[PDB]
Write a structure and sequence with these properties.
two-stranded antiparallel ribbon; 33% helix; binds the ligand O=C(Nc1ccc(OC(F)(F)F)cc1)c1cccc(CN2CCOCC2)c1; 9 helices; binds chloride ion; binds ligand STI; transferase
Length: 285
């Protein structure tokens, strides 16, 4: 099986024994994900397993990750799926999730230039997924990771029934993150790359505020109705007008009127080619 000679060969399949399983990750906030070590590489990894009908979504997540490779998407390193317990192994990201990272970070270090950089990296991963005709479905700061030198990667932790609190709430027989969810997704169950664009705009606001909770002090039962009547979050303090214009574009009612990720990414790279975000932020302020 493990030998290139076999018909049953999969390059992604690895030796379970090759990995030393340590403790659960982030105190359990990610479910059955464990810090690990790849012995031979002396490399920390993150290892997702199954806890005791649920097999095929896990195997399909494995299937999908084999299909995608981007600098800004968390990288599959291997699998153990020949026999239970099934593993999915990715790289481990030193600074953990972007949401907590934003709230806990030193702001002298994580300045406007670094925030812009973080938003840019995310838009590139999304450009890639756009181009490969994938949809993310739960784009948000809580689903991104941060490594060395402000490297940001887009992940998908499957958080809807793992996260405690009111982030995800019951809607349509399932748990939605209501404050990140595009109107057509809440109203008509319509999910697409353009509804990832809406969530990206909310993600952008999370970056701009250092991970404040969106629509702060607004009841969830009121979000759709406000949105339908053209309400949007106001420009965060310090936010350059152009970045806010970009947020406003992502939050078009009609999905078709939302920029594609390629255009979003193109705007980040253009927006400050001749003027620094630092000057704009200080101007705003
Ligand atoms: C261990 C593992 C197993 C699987 C995954 N998977 C993904 O992150 C992922 C990313 C993108 C897609 C693309 N996909 C397209 C289709 N739509 C519908 C879903 C998303 C799928 C899975 C990540 C991990 N990594 C992971 N998980 C939880 C926590 C951590 C972690 C925590 C702290 C520091 N370093 C790493 N790391
Ligand atoms: O950096 C800021 N905003 C911002 C917005 C968008 C943005 O672009 C992108 F693409 F989203 F990343 C980048 C940065 C910022 C926010 C609050 C306070 C201060 C400085 N002040 C310090 C003293 O106290 C008062 C505030 C700066
Ligand atoms: Cl998809």
């Amino acid at each position: 099986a493990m030998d290139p000679s076999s018909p049953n060969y999969d390059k992604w399949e690895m030796e379970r024994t090759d990995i030393t399983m340590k403790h659960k990750l982030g105190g359990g906030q990610y479910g059955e994900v464990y810090e690990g070590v790849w012995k031979k590489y002396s490399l920390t990894v993150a290892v997702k397993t199954l806890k005791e009908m649920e097999v095929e979504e896990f195997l399909k997540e494995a299937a999908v990750m084999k299909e995608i490779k981007h600098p800004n998407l968390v990288q599959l390193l291997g699998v153990c799926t020949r026999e239970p317990p099934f593993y999915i192994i990715t790289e481990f990201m030193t600074y953990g999730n972007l949401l907590d990272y934003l709230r806990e970070c030193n702001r002298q270090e994580v300045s406007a230039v670094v925030l812009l950089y973080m938003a840019t990296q995310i838009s590139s991963a999304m450009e890639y997924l756009e181009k490969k005709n994938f949809i993310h479905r739960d784009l948000a700061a809580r689903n991104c990771l941060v490594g060395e030198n402000h490297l940001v990667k887009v992940a998908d932790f499957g958080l809807s029934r793992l996260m405690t609190g009111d982030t995800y709430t019951a809607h349509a027989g399932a748990k939605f993150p209501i404050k990140w969810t595009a109107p057509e997704s809440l109203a008509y169950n319509k999910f697409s790359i353009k509804s990832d664009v809406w969530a990206f705009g909310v993600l952008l606001w999370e970056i701009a505020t250092y991970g404040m909770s969106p629509y702060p002090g607004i009841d969830l039962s009121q979000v759709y109705e406000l949105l339908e009547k053209d309400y949007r979050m106001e420009r965060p303090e310090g936010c350059p007008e152009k970045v806010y214009e970009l947020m406003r574009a992502c939050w078009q009612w009609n999905p078709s009127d939302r920029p594609s990720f390629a255009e979003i990414h193109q705007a980040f790279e253009t927006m400050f080619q001749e003027s620094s975000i630092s000057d704009e932020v200080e101007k705003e302020l």
